[PDB]
Amino acid sequence: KKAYFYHSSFQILNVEYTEALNSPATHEYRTLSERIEAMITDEFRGSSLKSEFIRTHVVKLRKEGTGVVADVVMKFRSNRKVMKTRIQSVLRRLSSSGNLEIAPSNEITSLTDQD
């Protein structure tokens, strides 16, 4: 078969960008990157792309505003447009606002289903 790479910039919800995030060598950077990679891996492992997904990795954490954005590369084995539409249906499971996002932790602020 053939290899395909996809990348996106995900808004990393509920995490303030701190200096430790400036360096890939820090505990903060590596643990957040590892959590994000585990989340993406788990989603594809539990999707229609389970046999095609190879692995993922955060290429870098960037600061946007005071929040964090993670540039992520995803590798698949298997048209790049076709693979893309399948991927989008999985990433949609990680989003709650329609944005390309990932929440290492979900904040609960009310007691009713706000959807």
UniProtKB/Swiss-Prot annotation:
Signal sequence, renumbered to the chain: none
Positions of the SEA domain: 2-114
Name of the protein in its database record: Transmembrane protease serine 11D non-catalytic chain
Domain of life: Eukaryota
